[PDB]
């Protein structure tokens, strides 16, 4: 039990909503489901990040402004009407500058992180290593009904 790993600032919002942002996302006249709307336990009609198309090749990436050691992440889906929508599993790539980017890997491949199973109940996954990066981003890969995300970093100062 080691006190590196605080909640770093999604859910409290001292991550700016400019700091989030994504491979794009889901919006038109009657919702918009944001890169800064991916934060844990938010309320709202469209209370969660949702990419423009349900596709592994999207990403949220979140922007610390300055080298964090992170630690985990916590991953939540929400519900619309009588649908779930959750991210079951999901990649995680880092990078220094926001252009050269590298997968996680544990155990000699690419970790494939089991996320959620429902809609509200959040799922921590701790990143052992940690990462000393400023840039943080979290791909998903397999998700149920729709690709839909809010989460938090977990971590503490680095440098």
């Given at each position: ?131 000393l990066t400023?840039?943080?981003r979290i ?21």
């Amino acid at each position: 039990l080691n006190s590196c790993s605080m909640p770093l600032g999604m859910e409290s919002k001292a991550i700016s909503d400019a700091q989030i942002t994504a491979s794009s996302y889901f919006t038109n006249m009657f919702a918009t489901w944001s890169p800064s709307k991916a934060r844990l336990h938010l309320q709202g009609r469209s209370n969660a990040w949702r990419p423009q198309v349900n596709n592994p090749k999207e990403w949220l990436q979140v922007d610390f402004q300055k080298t964090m050691k992170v630690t985990g992440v916590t991953t939540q889906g929400v519900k619309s009407l009588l649908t779930s929508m959750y991210v079951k599993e999901f990649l995680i790539s880092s990078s220094q500058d926001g252009h050269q980017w590298t997968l996680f890997f544990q155990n000699g491949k690419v970790k494939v992180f089991q996320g959620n199973q429902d809609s509200f109940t959040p799922v921590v996954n701790c990143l052992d290593p940690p990462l000393l990066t400023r840039y943080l981003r979290i791909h998903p890969q397999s998700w149920v009904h729709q690709i839909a995300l809010r989460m938090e970093v977990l971590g503490c100062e680095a440098q």
